[PDB]
Each structure stands twice: as C-alpha cells, then as structure tokens.
Amino acid sequence: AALLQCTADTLADAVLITTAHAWQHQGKTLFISRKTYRIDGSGQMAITVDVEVASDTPHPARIGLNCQLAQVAERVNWLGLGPQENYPDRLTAACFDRWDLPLSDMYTPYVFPSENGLRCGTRELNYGPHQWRGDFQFNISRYSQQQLMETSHRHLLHAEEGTWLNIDGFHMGIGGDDSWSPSVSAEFQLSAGRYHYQLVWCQK
Amino acid sequence: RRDWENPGVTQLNRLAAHPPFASWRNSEEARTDRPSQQLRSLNGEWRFAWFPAPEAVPESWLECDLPEADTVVVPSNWQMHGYDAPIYTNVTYPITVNPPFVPTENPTGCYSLTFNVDESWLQEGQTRIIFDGVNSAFHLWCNGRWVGYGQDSRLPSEFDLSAFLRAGENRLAVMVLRWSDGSYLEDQDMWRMSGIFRDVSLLHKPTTQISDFHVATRFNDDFSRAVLEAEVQMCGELRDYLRVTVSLWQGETQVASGTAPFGGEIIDERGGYADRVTLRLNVENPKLWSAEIPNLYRAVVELHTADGTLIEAEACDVGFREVRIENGLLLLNGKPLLIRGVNRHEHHPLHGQVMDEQTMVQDILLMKQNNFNAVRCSHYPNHPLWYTLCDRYGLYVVDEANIQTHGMVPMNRLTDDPRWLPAMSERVTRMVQRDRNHPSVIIWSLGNESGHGANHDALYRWIKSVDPSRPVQYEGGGADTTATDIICPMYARVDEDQPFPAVPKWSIKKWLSLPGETRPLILCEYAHAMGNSLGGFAKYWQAFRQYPRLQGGFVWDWVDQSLIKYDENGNPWSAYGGDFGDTPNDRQFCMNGLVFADRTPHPALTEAKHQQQFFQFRLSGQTIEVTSEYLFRHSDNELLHWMVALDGKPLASGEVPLDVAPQGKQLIELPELPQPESAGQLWLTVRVVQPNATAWSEAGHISAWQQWRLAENLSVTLPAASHAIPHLTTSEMDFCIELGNKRWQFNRQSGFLSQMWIGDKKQLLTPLRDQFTRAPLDNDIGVSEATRIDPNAWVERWKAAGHYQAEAALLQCTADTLADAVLITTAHAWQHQGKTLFISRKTYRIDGSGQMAITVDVEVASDTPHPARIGLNCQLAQVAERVNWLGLGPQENYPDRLTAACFDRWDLPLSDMYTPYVFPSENGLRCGTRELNYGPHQWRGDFQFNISRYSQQQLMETSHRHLLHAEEGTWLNIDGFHMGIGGDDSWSPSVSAEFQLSAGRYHYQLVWCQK
Ligand SMILES: [Mg+2]
Ligand SMILES: [Mg+2]
Ligand SMILES: [Mg+2]
Ligand code: NA
Ligand code: NA
Ligand code: NA
Ligand code: NA
Ligand code: NA
Fold this sequence. Notes:
This is part of a larger assembly, with two copies of chain A.
Chain A: E1 2-10, E2 14-25, E3 28-40, E4 45-53, E5 62-69, E6 75-82, E7 95-102, E8 119-127, E9 130-141, H1 145-150, E10 163-171, E11 194-203
Antiparallel strand pairs in A: 1-2, 2-3, 3-4, 4-11, 5-10, 6-7, 6-8, 8-9, 9-10, 9-11
The complex binds magnesium ion (3 copies) and sodium ion (5 copies).
One sodium ion (NA) is lined by residues 189, 589-590, 592 of chain B.
C-alpha cells in the first residue's frame, strides 16, 4: 500500500477523514482505494469506500477491509443470509433472517485450510460491543487469512489473539464445476473495474 | 353468379401457370436475356373509375369509355391516388368475418385501356394477356366480350385473347374487386390496398410452343460432377420433324448441349408423354451457386425443326446448387448454412405495394452491405424481378404461398376444411410452377399464421412429390408440425420458455433436444424491430454460433410500413395506421423495420451488421486469430486494419492482408507496441475492409469489426495542488459557492443545484434533478392502449406505481467547508401517495480547480417495478453545434444493444444525437462514456447519456416526430444506469433479467467542470 492522501476536516457536527491508497507491484498499480470516514456526534463512523481495479490485472478474490479485533466474544449475531457458510455462487440454500451462533460455528474446519465461513447479503453484524451496518459479506474467526494460507492441515492451526474480521463489499465465486481448471463463471468474477461499498461502524 | 363470393371458383378461363416466358424468335436474344418483341408491356396510362359496389357499375362501361373516369398510371394501388382509405389492421379482419361472404359495400375499381394490336399478332399464333398482380379479384372483358376471372393477388393471371382481339384498335375492361372469397386467404398484417398493382403485358407465342420447362441439377459426392436435367413440355400439333435443344452457357462459352425429338420414357401401362422430352447434360467441375459466390449459367431451350429452323426459344438463369437436410442440418452444397435473414414485405411509402427495380436493388444492396444473406417473402410470392435479382446478387430466398388466415377463430378454421383445399392448393401449386427454376429459392413456405390443418399436410406432400430439391417449411400450429421440415418458430426466445397452451414457444436451445426431435431450427421471425429495439440481438447470434442445429433466422422486419402525408404547407410526414381515418386500427404496429420507409437506416441496423459478421476474432497476448465463417469463398477481397489507442488518442496502427480459407483460421502477430507515457486504458480495434468494389459494395466497405481492452495504467499521480479556495455563502433559501468568476447555487427548499454562473452567464434553465423514468419505448408500451390497458406492460407498471408522478421530498440539505473545498450533502425521497419509491443521497464537492464532484447513491424499493433509468437531468442554457465524447459510438447504443458500438473519441453534430423514431421515445443514448463535452461543459465519470433539444416529457406526450419542437437550450440526461430496451417481441415484456435495474442500491459519480 502506497499512501497518496490523508486529510482531516473538522465540520459542524462531524470529523471527516479522507484517504487514498495505491497498491503497486514492480511499477504496476493494481488497485486504488479512495475512502472517507465521517465520525458524527452520535458516535457512528460512516466509511465510504471506492475501489479502482486495473482492467488488465487478474480479477481479485475480494474487495473489502480487514482487521484483528482485541475482543474475543462468545456469540456472533447478524441480519443476513444464513445460518450456514454461503458464497455468491453458493447461497441459494441460505435464508435472510436474524441469526445467532457461537463463534466456532463461523469457522468451517476444511481439512486443507482456506477462506471459509463467509456469510453473504448481510445488512447488520454484531460482535461484542461492535455493530457494522451496510450491505456486505463477512467472515469472523480466530484465524487470519495469512495463517489459513500458510497452514497445510486444519489440526496445525492455532487460535490467534483476538478475532480476525474480514468485511467484504464484494467477494468472488468459489466455483467447482471441476477442481483442476478455473471454474468460476464470468458473472461471479470481480470484473467491473470500479467498486463501491459503504459501512457504518458503531457501538451497541 | 357472384364468383367473388365462392371459394369453389378461383378462376374462369385462366391459362396454366408456368416459369417466366418471353417467346424469343432469336436464340442469341434468349441467351443474352435481351428484351423480346413478343413480350409487350401494357404499363402506362389507363382509364379508371371508382365504384362503391360492382352493382353500381354502368353497363356502358363494357363497350365505351366513361367521361367521369380519370387517367391513371398502371401499375398502381388506387388508395395511393386517394380514391378510398387504405385500411390497416393486425389480427382482426378489416371486414365482417362470415366466410365465404364479403361486404355488400365492396369498392370496385374499373380499369380500361384502348390500345393497338398489329394484324401479324392475330394472323398466326397465340396472343395472351398477363396480369402479374391484381388485388384481390377481377373480371376481364375484351372489346365488350367477357374473357375470364381470376383470384390470388400475388401471382400472374393469364388469358388467351386470340379470339377476342381485332386488327387495329382494341379495348380492355377490367373490373377489380377489393373484397372476394380470396381475401379470407389474404389476411396479412399490412395496408389493405387494391387495384392492378403489378405489370400488365401481352405475350405472343406460336401455336406449336414450349408450354413448360423444369431445370434440375444433380451432383456426385464432392460436387465435381453434375447433371443438368431439363424437362420440356409442348403445346400444339406434334410432328416427327420437331426437336428440342437445350444448350448451357457459362458467359459466352457453351459448355454443354443436347438435342432430342419429342417423346418421353414409358411411365405406365399407357406409355409415356408424347408431348414431352427430357434432356440430360453432363457438366464437369461446375461453378456452384451460393449467396457468397452467385455463379450463374444460362440454359436456353430451343424449339425447332430437324432441318434447323427455330420456332421459339425460352431461357433461364441456372445456379448449380444442392439443398438438403441431412442428420438434422440444412445443407447447401454439402455445407451447413447460417441464415442471416430478414423478412421483407413489398412496400414503398409513395407507391404503396407497387414494386420497382430501383427499390429492389436498393434493398438488396443495403441487405448485403449489412451482412444479410437471406430473405423471406413475407407473406406471398413477390414481383417476378425479385427472384432474378436474388439469383444474380446472391441471396437465399424462402418463397411463400399467398395464404394467411390470421383472423380466423380458431386459426385453422379454413385450413382444416376440405372445402377450402382447392383454393389453397392453387396458391401453393401456381407459386411452385412459376418459381421452381430460380436457384435463389432454397425453401418453400406453405404460407403464414393459418394454424395447422389437414390442407397443409396435403400440400406439404404435394411439394415434396413434385420438387424434392427444396425443403418445405411452415410455422402454423406450433412451428414443429408434420407440415414442416424445419422447426421455424416466430419470436421464440433464446433461453426463456413461453409455454402457451397447444402452441408453446420453447427456448430455441431447449426446442432442439425435445424428446424425439431431430430437425434444424431456423426462426421464420425473430428480433421484432419496432421503434427503439433489437435489444438482446447478440444473445441470438451467440446461440446460433454455439449450436450446430440452430441455423439462424429472419429478422422482423426490413422496412417500416409508413406512408407519406402532407400538411398545410405541403411538407411531407410519415403516417401509420390510424392517420388515414381507418378504424379500428393497430396504430404504429406497421413500423417494425430495420430501415425507415425511405431506406434510411435505424440505429438497430448496425447491431445486426456486427452480429451477422462473417469473420470471428479472438485475442491472445499479441496474437489476433481470425476465423472465416464463409462456407465456400476464400477471403480474396479483405484486408485487416488494426488500431491501438489510449483514451481515443491513436498510438499505433497497421494493415495485414487476410488470406483465410472458408471455415479456416489466420493468426496475426501484432508488432511490439510501445508503452504509453500517459495514464489510461489502451484499446485495440480491428476492422475487415474490402479494398475492391463489388456488384453490391463500394471500395473500402467495412464488413467486420471488433474491440478489446489492452493494458491499463491507473492514474496515481496527484494533480498540482490548487491555490484557489472556494467560498460558501449562506442565505435562508440558498447555499452559494464562489470561486473567482464562478458561482454554484443550491436551493435549500428543493435541495437541488438550481443555477450556475460563469460571470453574468447563467448555465441552467431547469435545475439538476434525479430522473428515474424514460419516455416509453414501443417495447415498454406493447399492446397497451388508453381504452385497453395491459397492466403487465412496463409503461403501465411504471404508471401505476407513480414513477412518472413521483414528487421529491427533501430530507437533508447541508453545507460544510473543507480545507480546500465546499461540501454540499443532500437527501431526497421520491414518494407516490405515501409510498417511498426511491431515495437519493448526494454529495457535491467543489474544489479550487472549479471541478464539481457529484456522488449519487440511490435506494430503490424492492417492491416497486424496476425503474427505466437511474440518472440526473437538467436543461442547459447553451445550444452548441457539436457533441464530443469518449465512449461507445458513434451511433445510438443501449445496454442490451451496444455490441456494434466502439469505444473511441467521437464528434458529431447535435442533431445526430437524436434518433427520429416516427413514434417519439427515449432515444439517442450512448453508453460506457467516460467523458462528455458540450459547449463550455465537461462531464467525467462512467455513465450513459443522451443530449437533445427535446425533453423526455415532450417525447412522451407527442404522438408523431413531425409534431416535435426544439425547446430552449439543451436537455441533458446523464444516467449512472439505464434499463435494457428488449425487443424479442413487442407485445409482452422482453427486457432480459440481466438488463433490468433490480439491484436495489445503486452508486454513480460524476465530475462537472468548465472545459
Ligand atoms: Mg435463493
Ligand atoms: Mg371465388
Ligand atoms: Mg464486442
Ligand atoms: Na492452506
Ligand atoms: Na448454428
Ligand atoms: Na406489424
Ligand atoms: Na485478401
Ligand atoms: Na410519444
């Protein structure tokens, strides 16, 4: 990530932070992310994200944000598709409703660790004192994408400190027509070039 | 006798049908197809009197000319001379449905001609009269004496006048009836016209004459050998000294000849035909006929004596080709066809249903130039010259019998009735007898929309028996009946089933593989081109190319059926059904053409051209793969031009000759392209250019094109920090932003940008507001009317939801000052009677560079019908001459009709940004636009736009294009998103789900600045 812009403006009833980043590899700009964070007097932080994706780079796996929360809470509560893991090209079985599960249920123990436990079409997510609202896909677990990527077997995984949260405006299909050639259909690839999502982060 | 109310009487004293005759008395004239003195045209000035009924015709008209009669040009339709109103109706009959009876008020056209006949014509031989087209029925008199009667408006009626004519002055009297029992088989959806609308001629033959001839061409397995078989029939006295010679010519070279006396082979217990002979000519390595290469020979049939004296000669153009269906594929010369077809009615805006060579040639040229290879004679045999031209220019023809009974309840009432079999048989049999020698005819059709009856099955088998060289098709009764060799639906969709009872229209892909089904599928009608249409056209062609047994179709249709009317100042305007005082009518449903009546193209024609391309392209790295879709011809008149541009700025270009075999491939390696200095998207454009002129095109003709995105460099470089700081001024009614000379005014009561100034110059006439509606397209409306509402039609769903009446309620309007900018935040709710339809949330950011960044985020209630568009609109004060944009163009393009459009820098006059559809609607949109320039203004983003002197409101409220008036300034519509136009048909919703605005939440952003 290369920082292009980071400004702060004090408004009548809010503070507005504006940022711009470029992700580059060997001279090539892959992605540009432009954001505003508006924190108002009600204590809510509205995050607006606008992403550019180079048309000649391979379509990305996801367009989102991630962080490691210090909190480890017992339950995960959301208003979206569930209760089980669902992805854009595998979500017909899932139902839109209010779901409440133990954190461990938000992780799928695939023998070969990978991205897992996504829930799509989520309008509200609750974890400990935090609430995220918008229209997003998320997963939440004690395992980072890095660890999942670097660990060969599920039994070798160790719970990390706190909780890793991945919130996606957009997520690529998983495919599966076969498992030896690209099988994600065009309509589930992230090929639009420009992507927009908005999130509100507040305390319960 | 009232023969015009009797299906048992279709003719009286009519001669047999036959291929085109000229009775040359010189063989060389027959070879070269020069005019014949034995075939005399009676076209020109005739006398005409209109009557309300045949009973109203005075008995003196048979012998003497009427003083009340006017002089008119023949051929003509008498409605085009203003004698009565041309009635237009779709499904319903224009008369009372009571077969076989017609109205007592039956408009009667009394034609007459006084002409000279030379004694030499009457001293020997036979003089016949030929009426190529009389609508719908007629009685004939010659010198006061009754000659005969004829029906079928679309085939020649011929009568022997040898005993009726006298040396010197002769008078013909033709009583033409608008309505007859023949009308029940002539219920086509078009203008109901009448009169002598095709040629009238006299033909002199000797008494010993060629009465018929049939030409067949058969081939060996690889088409390297052929046998031409010519059956010749005679009339007159049989003599042993009589001979027939058939000679075959390739240009001026005679390739084969055969001579024989009369007397065919034994066929039964009674012997054979003494008045017939069959000649068989061997042809080695024949040059084959196709639409790609219309190679023709000339066959000359000589009737003569053994000592060498010619009696007469007839002749025809011969195309060596084989049409067969094998293993479910329609094949021509062993190769599977892909039909790039169109339906073509015979229509001229000035002459009605009268056809001329100039118009026919104009149509064929435009068709071939737009990659059509096929034409369906909807829905009747055509003027005889049409087939000659298709033979010579190369178009595949579906010849169709003049049988349509669409108004019957049920549709097969007459066609399943054995009492109507005689009349139906004549329409099929007489077409085959006339047109069977034309190579351009590859498929016979039994008619149109007449259900499926036993009469169809009988006539299907008749054709199969007499002419096995051509498949038979027929759509009626579900498109896949026992009376068709080809599954030939009308408006069956690509992926979507329409499971109507008894006659379902399956998805064409699904239809092929139904249990037991093996036949090819070629749509007799598809892609209804009514108004702003042809949305989803690319979906058909992708399917056609992927599925072997999907072999194309015929677009509905070629030409708008509008006629010319004049106002007070004598200025012409295009009129449809209902403008001529005819009621009940079917409004603008006569205008479904790819071209206007004057043959000016609609925007949809370019989409057709692109999808029907004969070359296919793929790109892999630096390699362009070109695939030929030609079946027979090498690419011997083709050059590939390639261009690489960065956001419209050309960086590299070149040309490479194409040398591709039919069905072959060519790989073209592009040279090392230098990496651009600037940020932006590189685009590759290729086009196939024809360097040499042809019979159908000019030098430089572009036949194919394609585009790809190459490398993109995203802009990361921060622009030089602007020194100027915009200032906010607040009043109770307005937020005002100032930057030097420039001013932006936001109205606080409405929440919209109401005005902009540069110095003292106002920029807006109407504020910038959200827009969620469009002036409804013909496809949006369907068959919905004010008296007969179709609640399923898109326009009615939008109306009932309050979309057009939606009023903006302000929720939020704030102003913030940033370090180097002013931020305006707004929120509006669009509500109809308590219901929130849409919410629009916006920010306007104006910085020291004078750029106004607009961000728009829209919520659409999930239970409201999906909106026509999600955009902004305003009336600009400026009227500028030019429109300049970086985006898809140059022509009008919509989300489901933008494949033909290319991404480049385009610059057109403002008037070219409006499409003059006869029925005004949303028009002129250009999609995928990143920059738009108009006068002092520049807009940047990723949007769809149209720009014109007409508001959406005026387009929607005005019935005809000629009633439109340029409004003050310029109406700009900038859409983040726009709904598809559809067009699979124009009587039910046809916008595919992927082109409907159903996402619920939408985001777009624009930048507005001075240029
Ligand atoms: Mg579902
Ligand atoms: Mg009759
Ligand atoms: Mg394309
Ligand atoms: Na792993
Ligand atoms: Na095909
Ligand atoms: Na029509
Ligand atoms: Na060439
Ligand atoms: Na209108």
